[PDB]
Amino acid sequence: MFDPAEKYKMDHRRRGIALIFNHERFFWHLTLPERRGTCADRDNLTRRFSDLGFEVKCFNDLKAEELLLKIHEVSTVSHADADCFVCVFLSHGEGNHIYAYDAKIEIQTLTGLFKGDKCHSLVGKPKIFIIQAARGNTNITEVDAASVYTLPAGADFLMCYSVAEGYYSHRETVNGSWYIQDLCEMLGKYGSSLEFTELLTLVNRKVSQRRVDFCKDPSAIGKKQVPCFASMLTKKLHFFPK
Amino acid sequence: AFYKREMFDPAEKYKMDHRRRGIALIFNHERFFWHLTLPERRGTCADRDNLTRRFSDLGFEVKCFNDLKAEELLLKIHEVSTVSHADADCFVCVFLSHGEGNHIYAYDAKIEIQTLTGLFKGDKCHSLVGKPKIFIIQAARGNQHDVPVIPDTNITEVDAASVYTLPAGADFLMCYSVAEGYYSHRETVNGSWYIQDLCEMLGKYGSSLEFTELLTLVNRKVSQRRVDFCKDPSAIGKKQVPCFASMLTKKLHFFPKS
Ligand SMILES: Oc1cc(F)ccc1CNc1ncccc1-c1ncccn1
């Protein structure tokens, strides 16, 4: 019968892989600014997801061909013994695209690799994409206009965005991104007990409550950040200790 | 001695103890000005009535509008955005129509979704600040084998997803019948797959379940639906995957009001 509280089965041998694509600088021809603070984000995420049982693999400043090769490689190995899959992008972006070192990649191309017909062993399992990407312009706060569309994907995907249309993404050059900081704080405290979209909702509250009435940089005043997640999940998702 | 200090609470819920639940608007579009070259939407009136009963049972004041022109629709939604919602828990707005990109069709023209949600952001609607603003959108691509000229068996019509899964402001929840690359289904007597399943879940669980948890059940119900191969073989590969884009900041329940 229909169960209103059904949860994803998370009792496989492994939690699964968490991929992190970390982009700090870009080929000069793209004329994009460096992303100081992103290495703090990478380390923060690595610790949180490792603690949740994930096998975390980080890749710094891959070219687009290299990045596509790597994510395709992961999409074609067996996830039969895994609970789920996580993929994080830390970069600049525009519209449907995220930047690699030398060129843009379409988000739909990346998510498409993990759809049922392409990745059988993840069918019915959570596929979670976390995207910290917006428009490229001592602890300094950099402020970027939202630019990356809050795109959906297939069944059992969860697409998590640092910022919604009309708002602004913030990154501290020492402490890291507002969104990743608050995400990681919540993961550390509640990741192993709370339902994951409930947790992302806490992240929405934390980030949107950060004040922008008195910035060190006067030009940043009033540039609020509101994250968003787009859920195509079909069950409750927990990361209880394995 | 106990009280809730202002510490971060992982279980915080929207306060839903106002005098009224709030207004639920339903914009119901069954047919369109001939110049738009859009097909009729048989079954949408079942959707409208279904939604009216479920949201009324949850305490909402439901107001339905059928086939408004774009000017009329904008006037009406602007009217609602400019009254005081001080005594309300929340606000619901439903669109049942065709759509394309960031647009929903009214009777005679397209309207941009951001124009509609924009009316309810921050100071434009102060009395809804910090309160859930829930938009439910059943809108996809009208099949246009259908002349540019001036014009009950249960059939399942299948429309490609066309409307962007747009976000909005803080405390908005944007609910979409279908995601990019999938297909929306509507039975000409029984109504839309998404609305049918939304309404069934509202009736069974609406008064207890956290609302995004309920929307997740709707995702499961809809994405598991299949058409019978005999009635329409051409619909075989056309799965429906709904989604919701949450900018909510707290848990949302619709417990019966005291
Ligand atoms: O979500 C956003 C985030 C931003 F930073 C800026 C603008 C938008 C709104 N646009 C979209 N949002 C979701 C899905 C598709 C689109 C979309 N797709 C094509 C063209 C326009 N919008």
From Swiss-Prot, chain A:
Task: Kindly list the places in or outside the cell where this protein is found, as annotated in its UniProt entry.
Answer: Cytoplasm; Nucleus
| Modified residue annotations for Phosphoserine | 50, 208
Catalytic reactions of this protein? Strict requirement for Asp at position P1 and has a preferred cleavage sequence of Val-Glu-His-Asp-|-
Effect listed in the UniProt record for changing residue 92 to A:
Catalytically inactive active-site mutant
Q: How is its activity regulated?
A: During activation, the N-terminal disordered prodomain is removed by cleavage. Concomitantly, double cleavage gives rise to a large 18-kDa and a small 11-kDa subunit. The two large and two small subunits then assemble to form the active CASP6 complex. Can be cleaved and activated by different caspases, depending on the context. Cleaved and activated by caspase-8 (CASP8) and subsequently by caspase-3 (CASP3).
Lipid-modified residues of type S-palmitoyl cysteine are 215, 228
Question: Which of the seven top EC classes does this enzyme belong to?
Answer: hydrolase
Which keywords does the record carry?
Apoptosis, Autocatalytic cleavage, Cytoplasm, Hydrolase, Lipoprotein, Nucleus, Palmitate, Phosphoprotein, Protease, Thiol protease, Zymogen
Give the family, as the similarity comment puts it: Belongs to the peptidase C14A family.
Complex formation:
Heterotetramer that consists of two anti-parallel arranged heterodimers, each one formed by a 18 kDa (p18) and a 11 kDa (p11) subunits. Interacts with BIRC6/bruce. Interacts with RIPK3.
So what does this one do? Answer: Cysteine protease that plays essential roles in programmed cell death, axonal degeneration, development and innate immunity. Acts as a non-canonical executioner caspase during apoptosis: localizes in the nucleus and cleaves the nuclear structural protein NUMA1 and lamin A/LMNA thereby inducing nuclear shrinkage and fragmentation. Lamin-A/LMNA cleavage is required for chromatin condensation and nuclear disassembly during apoptotic execution.
Protein's UniProt name: Caspase-6
Provide the organism lineage as a comma list.
Eukaryota, Metazoa, Chordata, Craniata, Vertebrata
Gene name per UniProt? CASP6
